Design a protein around this ligand. Structure first.
Ligand SMILES: COc1cnc2ccc([C@@](C)(F)c3nnc4c(F)cc(-c5cc(C)no5)cn34)cc2c1
Length: 289
């Protein structure tokens, strides 16, 4: 893997020095896999900054190198406390580049809320939801559409700060169960998180991210129950069109369920913005002790 600066959009050339990590600056501990995606494994690494280093060597070919760099450059300029940051990319003589992310001590949000070790309160769970909403408000303000928002796709650091993850160079399928193959297009889709219109057109928007966020809130309040367990894959469209939504979890406050129903409005344009979600959830959160 060689970097040809001329091949890039000339406006981005200056950003390369800030995204590329010199191999001498990074040590990666390949002895133990700490995480797995469809595109490769992840390992502990030290930059002493502790990091998660993701290999992309399960992919046959990584595509256009200039595009990969461009994706990295665009990703690295995102900075928000509820969005996973890119520390950089590191080139290795043999194999694809390594993607270098901050280490997230407590892993993905779904597994965290399912863990018997931890006991977040209803207030804590709502706060996790608020943090996600803030990250998504940021991403939406950058006109970035996530396309795969779900509890499995957010992570928690050592201070229990929630970060929207699984985007840009960290994008992957980290739990294959929840992705079904479309018969016409072949795309593997997170159907149980998708908006009605996306199930029909396969177009994703910020308003379809809002639908997914509604599902994520439901996951939080059920402590990571699988949505629609008694529905099979693409029959979700028929199920929803019967006039159905996920039921109100026992400990979900009534106004938070109302927020969920708004996220699942049949008219995409009538769903709340992430700014409105931050406002509404902040209020509900403030009522708890
Ligand atoms: C287990 O220890 C860690 C610590 N930090 C990590 C940071 C990123 C990642 C990385 C690059 F895979 C990643 N980036 N975004 C996501 C994400 F949204 C979800 C997951 C994830 C979910 C499951 C289940 N396993 O991994 C992994 N993700 C993995 C880490 C693993």
């Amino acid at each position: 893997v060689h970097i040809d600066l001329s091949a890039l959009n000339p406006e981005l050339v200056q950003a390369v020095q800030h995204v590329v990590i010199g191999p001498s600056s990074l040590i990666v501990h390949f002895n133990e896999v700490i995480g797995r995606g469809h595109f490769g494994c992840v390992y502990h690494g030290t930059l002493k900054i502790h990091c998660a280093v993701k290999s992309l060597n399960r992919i046959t070919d990584i595509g256009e190198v200039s595009q990969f760099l461009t994706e990295g450059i665009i990703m690295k300029d995102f900075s928000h406390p509820n969005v996973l940051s890119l520390l950089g990319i590191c080139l290795r003589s043999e194999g694809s580049p390594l993607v270098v992310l901050p280490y997230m001590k407590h892993g993905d949000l779904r597994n965290f809320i399912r863990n018997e070790t931890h006991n977040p309160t209803v207030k804590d769970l709502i706060g996790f939801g608020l943090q996600v909403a803030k990250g998504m408000k940021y991403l939406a303000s950058k006109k970035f559409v996530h396309r795969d928002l779900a509890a499995r796709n957010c992570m928690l650091d050592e201070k229990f700060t929630v970060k929207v993850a699984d985007f840009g160079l960290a994008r992957d399928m980290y739990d294959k169960e929840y992705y079904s193959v479309h018969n016409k297009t072949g795309a593997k889709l997170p159907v149980k998180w998708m908006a009605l219109e996306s199930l029909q057109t396969q177009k994703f928007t910020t308003k379809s991210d809002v639908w997914s966020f509604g599902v994520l809130l439901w996951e939080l309040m059920t402590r990571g129950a699988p949505p629609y367990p008694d529905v099979n894959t693409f029959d979700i469209t028929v199920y929803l069109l019967q006039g159905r939504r996920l039921l109100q979890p026992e400990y979900c406050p009534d106004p938070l369920y109302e927020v969920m129903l708004k996220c699942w409005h049949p008219k995409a344009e009538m769903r709340p913005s992430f700014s409105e979600l931050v406002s509404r959830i902040s209020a509900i959160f403030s009522t708890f002790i």
